[PDB]
């Protein structure tokens, strides 16, 4: 069960810029050749977003170290991560992140997504452990590193995977009306963010933490190593804010262009006319 | 690290069956393959059997065919090894060992403390004493080598003295062989001047206190 | 069991380098790189020293390193320190079986080399009056500890009936060994000679006794 995988501190706050990325179809209603203006929780243009290094290696000098933080969800979250290796499996969203309240668990595996809203006693350092089943001759995944006790399940949703050269994955999370609304676009490496699912979970979402997968390290006799290491991983988190946007829909319905009206006086002039 | 703890030592009689446990800690049983070896007193290591990672199938060595049976229970994280048709040769320390299954590099990284299985239908018995007589100019020319055989004694210890303790120089009493029968046997020798065989007399004083036996055997040239 | 061939003893002065060889075939040591090496102090469970031919687990000092050539592997222990006096066992996969081989005793030499002193006794007449006959071959005052005893009837080997003590440290700080060979009196009077082959550090001493009555 729970592994006590703490490093001294998240010392550097890493930042970057969200040039034009967080534009999500705010409604599912098809419109054609139109200029629809909406006030909604968008990612502001040229916002300063944060680069998180979750698994960040120490060169020839040292082995890797682990800094996966619990983060606020505030009013919304733009998530982004371009990764070759299935290290980022999902997220946990919730309030207390212990039993006292319920919380949301989103874990994506090679066959399926599992989405759960249930009272989880989350381990203080959370991950999904992948181990070798000698009989099967395949590696298999254990969820009990994430949660040690499961109680009071109201929601279970199992479906086809989303997160599964480098393939940028972009996500927008909202929790409004008791409805966890998820928007997603994958990009192999201007682009519409197209809705994934609206889950009726009906819970308070105030904070979240990324879910990471750590292969078991079958150590030789003398190592003092953790026993849980898997590749390297990094991700980008930004926060949605209330904004009026002018979205331009195609003849085919596609959002070809959008403008943040509060960014600069020119964008306001395009907005008013 | 993985930690292997075996069942306590046990004593058996010929024909019987014995079962040895092995509890694994630190890593769960389904992530690491289990192999059992044995070491006779003083002798080398002998592989009894194990688990083939690539071909999931326990493998049994040719020595213990239809006589050993190794089972594992994943819930209790415990490995088991049953040996039937026990005989005195099986008297050994039995180790459970482990190798990783993913790599399959056949390296038994971690070992149990060992379980001593002792097979003997042996009860307390006094020694049967025989002379190991010298010859004229037997060894080393003007020296002679003369002795005394404590045979088929159980349990250990015997004590040998020579001439009721008069002879202490020249005397070497060797350690015992625990033979296949479950009984011990030893020999005690003294190296003496070959001049002295004519006058001097050599008594062997064996006394085996468990069987409550005191044997005095006089060794003379013949 | 004894699938791999490996020498009985290895002598070395402190600070020197010793090499214990493990010789097999093209199907066990020559076919794979799955060779391993294990230390064992007396009365204590074995310990891994070299894994995967040349690799070394952590905590094992630099001075232990192994390699292989053709059908023969070898473990080399430089910087000899008294912690190294033990038995050393090699191991290797055989395709269907994993078999340890023999032993070898490093003897960190703290005393000049001593050759054994051997005495062979025939069965006593009194013993074969009871229709049992037992040769007694006693070995004393040899350093290093390990010795190898063979029995030869006539000039033909005696495979069966041989029970030998492991060497035991004596008052001298040298070592002594005991070997007994059990015969029927019929067999003892049939063959015209019996002999106790004793070999220590390559040299073989021989004691021979026959029924001249
Ligand atoms: C990912 O999750 C799914 C569903 O939880 C796994 O699918 C199998 O689900 C059945 C349900 O009866 C379980 O009994 C099996 O153990 C699961 N299969 C295996 C092989 O574990 C799916 O396999 C999961 N992925 C992995 C790698 O375990
Ligand atoms: C953040 O966005 C501002 C505009 O709000 C931009 O000028 C700046 O270059 C960005 N800064 C960083 C560090 O990404
Ligand atoms: C780490 O160990 C301490 C000591 O028991 C404990 O208080 C803490 O909860 C552990 N960390 C976990 C569960 O991640
Ligand atoms: C794979 O592992 C699962 C573990 O729950 C087991 O139920 C299943 O039978 C295994 N499959 C095979 C083919 O062994
Ligand atoms: C489960 O949570 C609900 C409220 O979300 C509460 O009414 C109920 O008592 C809880 N169940 C348990 C077993 O605590
Ligand atoms: C969410 O928080 C509100 C305000 O504290 C509370 O009334 C409500 O019961 C909470 N619901 C859940 C599911 O936690
Ligand atoms: C518009 O749609 C048609 C099919 O509906 C498609 O062939 C075309 O590529 C789309 N793009 C344009 C021209 O808007
Ligand atoms: Ca975009
Ligand atoms: Ca409750
Ligand atoms: Ca799963
Ligand atoms: Ca934490
Ligand atoms: Ca359920
Ligand atoms: Ca569309
Ligand atoms: Ca017991
Ligand atoms: Ca039986
Ligand atoms: Ca099996
Ligand atoms: Ca097995
Ligand atoms: Ca059975
Ligand atoms: Ca293989
Ligand atoms: Ca023991
Ligand atoms: Ca003689
Ligand atoms: Ca008398
Ligand atoms: Ca050492
Ligand atoms: Ca095969
Ligand atoms: Ca040996
Ligand atoms: Ca000598
Ligand atoms: Ca002698
Ligand atoms: Ca010495
Ligand atoms: Ca006998
Ligand atoms: Ca004779």
Cα(A151)–Cα(C7) distance, rounded to whole angstroms? Answer: 63
Is residue C4 situated within a structural domain? Answer: no
Give the number of domains in chain C. 2
Query: What is the C-alpha to C-alpha distance for residues A18 and A170, in angstroms, rounded to an integer?
Result: 12
Q: Which of helix, strand or coil describes residue C114?
A: strand
H or E stretch at A270: helix A265-272
Same domain, yes or no: C124 and C92:
no
Q: Among B46, B130, B185, select the one facing C124 at the smallest CB separation.
A: B130
> In a 3-state reduction of DSSP, which class is residue A265?
helix
C-alpha B44: how far from chain center:
12
- Which residues have a beta carbon within 5 Å of ligand 25, which is an ion? C 87, 103
Task: Choose which residue among A97, A204, A207 to substitute to test ligand 6 binding: the one with the highest number of ligand atoms within 8 A of its C-beta.
Answer: A204
C101 and C127 share a domain?
A: no
Look at the block and give the residue holding tokens 């003590």: C165
Domain final residue pick, C56, C86, C108: C108
Across B11-39, b (16+ Cβ under 10 Å) vs e yields: ebeeebebebbbbbeebebbbbbbbbbbb
Lookup result for tokens 């590193």: A145
Burial bucket for residue B195 (CB in 10 Å: 0-12, 13-18, 19+): exposed
- The per-residue b/e assignment along A27-55, b for 16 or more CB within 10 angstroms, e otherwise, is eeeeeeeeeeeeebbbbbbebebeebbbb
**Domain range list for chain A:** 15-272
- Within-domain flag for C94: yes
Asked if residue C15 and residue C96 are part of one domain, the reply reads: yes
Which is nearest to C63 in space by CA: C9, C18, C22? C18
Residue closest to A103 by CA, chosen among A211, A241, A228 = A211
- In the three-class reduction of DSSP (H, G, I as helix; E, B as strand; rest coil), residue B53 is classed as coil
CB spacing of B31 vs A132 below 8 angstroms = yes
| Ligand 2 atom at minimum distance from A47 CA | 2
Residues C100 and C125 in one domain: no
Q: Find the CATH number of the domain harbouring C53.
A: 2.60.40.10
Give φ, ψ of A14 to 5 degrees: -95, 135
- Residues C127 and C85 reside in one and the same domain: no
Q: Which CATH code fits B128-219?
A: 2.60.40.10
User: C125 and C143 in one domain?
Assistant: yes
Tell me which DSSP letter residue B111 carries: E
Give the whole-angstrom CA distance, residue B222 versus residue C188. 18
B window 73-132, beta carbon within 8 A of A: 100-103, 109-110
Q: Fold for A15-272, please state it.
A: Jelly Rolls (2.60.120)
Residue recorded with tokens 């294990």: C38
User: Method of determination?
Assistant: X-ray
C90 and C132: one domain? no
B51 touching chain A per CB within 8 A:
yes
Dist. CA A220–CA C56, nearest whole Å:
9
Nearest to A135 among B30, B32, B109 (CB): B30
Final residue of a domain: which of C75, C108, C141? C108
Say if B27 is an interface residue toward chain A (CB within 8 Å).
Answer: yes
Q: Does residue B142 come out as left (phi exceeding 0), alpha (psi in the -120 to 50 range) or beta?
A: alpha
C136-167 CB burial, b ≥16 within 10 A, e <16: bbbbbebbbbbbebbbebeeeebeebbbbbbb
Are residues C133 and C178 part of one domain?
yes
- Show the domain range for C199: 117-209
Q: Within this chain, do residues C140 and C169 fall inside the same structural domain, yes or no?
A: yes
Burial of C123 (C-beta count, 10 Å sphere; 0-12/13-18/19+)? buried
Interface of C with B in 114-173 (CB under 8 A): 119, 121, 124-127, 130, 134, 136, 138, 140, 163-166, 168, 170
Q: How close, in Å, is residue B137 to chain A by CA atoms? A: 60
List B69's β-bridge partners, or say none. B82
Could you tell me if residue C183 is inside a domain? yes
Q: Where are chain B's structural domains?
A: 3-119, 128-219
Place of tokens 């590696």: A139
For the B3-119 domain, the top CATH level (class) is mainly beta
Distance from CA of B51 to the nearest CA of A (A): 10
Same domain? C84 vs C137? no
């Amino acid at each position: 069960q729970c592994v006590n995988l703490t490093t001294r501190t998240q010392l550097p706050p890493a930042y970057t810029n969200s040039f034009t990325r967080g534009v999500y179809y705010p409604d599912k209603v098809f419109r054609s050749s139109v200029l629809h203006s909406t006030q909604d929780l968008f990612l502001p243009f040229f916002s300063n977003v944060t680069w998180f290094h979750a698994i960040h290696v120490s060169g020839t000098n040292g082995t890797k170290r682990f800094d996966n933080p619990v983060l606020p969800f505030n009013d919304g979250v733009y998530f982004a991560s371009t990764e070759k290796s299935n290290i980022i499996r999902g997220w946990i969203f919730g309030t207390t992140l212990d039993s006292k309240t319920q919380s949301l668990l989103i874990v994506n595996n090679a066959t399926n997504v599992v989405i759960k809203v249930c009272e989880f006693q989350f381990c203080n350092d959370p991950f999904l452990g992948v181990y070798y089943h000698k009989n099967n001759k395949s590696w298999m995944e254990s969820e009990f590193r994430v949660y040690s006790s499961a109680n009071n399940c109201t929601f279970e949703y199992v479906s086809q995977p989303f997160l599964m050269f480098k393939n940028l994955r972009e996500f927008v999370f909202k929790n409004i009306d008791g409805y966890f609304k998820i928007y997603s676009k994958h990009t192999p490496i201007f682009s519409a963010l197209e809705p994934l699912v609206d889950l009726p979970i009906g819970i308070n979402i105030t904070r979240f933490q990324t879910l990471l997968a750590l292969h078991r390290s079958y150590l030789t006799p003398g190592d003092s190593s953790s026993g849980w290491t898997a590749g390297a991983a990094a991700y980008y988190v930004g926060y949605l804010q209330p904004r009026t946007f002018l979205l331009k829909y195609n003849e085919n319905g596609t959002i070809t262009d959008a403008v943040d009206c509060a960014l600069d006086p020119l964008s306001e002039t395009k907005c008013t006319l | 690290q993985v930690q292997l703890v075996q069942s306590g030592a046990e004593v058996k009689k010929p024909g019987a069956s014995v079962k040895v446990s092995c509890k694994v800690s630190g890593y769960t049983l389904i992530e690491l393959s289990m192999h059992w070896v044995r070491q006779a007193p003083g002798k080398g290591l002998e592989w009894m059997g194990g688990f083939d990672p690539e071909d999931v199938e326990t493998i049994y060595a040719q020595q213990f065919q239809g006589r050993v049976t190794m089972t594992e229970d994943t819930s209790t994280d415990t490995a088991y090894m049953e040996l039937s048709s026990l005989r005195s040769e099986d008297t050994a320390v039995y180790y459970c060992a482990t190798g990783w299954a993913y790599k399959s590099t056949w390296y038994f990284g971690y070992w149990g403390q060992g379980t001593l299985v002792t097979v003997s239908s042996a009860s307390t018995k006094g020694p049967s004493v025989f002379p190991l007589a010298p010859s004229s100019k037997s060894t080393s020319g003007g020296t002679a080598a003369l002795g005394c055989l404590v045979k088929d004694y159980f349990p250990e210890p015997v004590t040998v003295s020579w001439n009721s303790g008069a002879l202490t120089s020249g005397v070497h009493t060797f350690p015992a062989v625990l033979q296949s029968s479950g009984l011990y046997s030893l020999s005690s020798v003294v190296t003496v001047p070959s001049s002295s065989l004519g006058t001097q007399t050599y008594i062997c004083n064996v006394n085996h206190k468990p069987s409550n036996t005191k044997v005095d055997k006089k060794v003379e040239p013949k | 069991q004894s699938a791999l061939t490996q020498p009985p003893s290895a002598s070395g002065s402190p600070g020197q380098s010793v090499t214990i060889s493990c010789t097999g075939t093209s199907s066990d040591v020559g076919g794979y790189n799955y060779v391993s090496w294990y230390q064992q102090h007396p009365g204590k469970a074995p310990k891994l020293m070299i894994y995967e031919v040349s690799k070394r687990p952590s905590g094992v000092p630099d001075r232990f390193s192994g390699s292989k050539s053709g059908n023969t592997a070898s473990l080399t222990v430089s910087g000899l320190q008294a912690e190294d006096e033990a038995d050393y066992y090699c191991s290797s996969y055989a395709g269907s079986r994993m078999g340890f081989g023999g032993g070898t005793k490093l003897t960190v030499l703290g005393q000049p080399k001593a050759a054994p002193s051997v005495t062979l006794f025939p069965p006593s007449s009194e013993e074969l009056q009871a229709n049992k006959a037992t040769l007694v071959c006693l070995i004393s005052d040899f350093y290093p500890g390990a010795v190898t005893v063979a029995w030869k009837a006539d000039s033909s080997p005696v495979k069966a009936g041989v029970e030998t003590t492991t060497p035991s440290k004596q008052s001298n700080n040298k070592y002594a060994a005991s070997s007994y060979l059990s015969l029927t009196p019929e067999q003892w009077k049939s063959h015209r000679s019996y002999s106790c082959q004793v070999t220590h550090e390559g040299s073989t001493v021989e004691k021979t006794v026959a029924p001249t009555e």
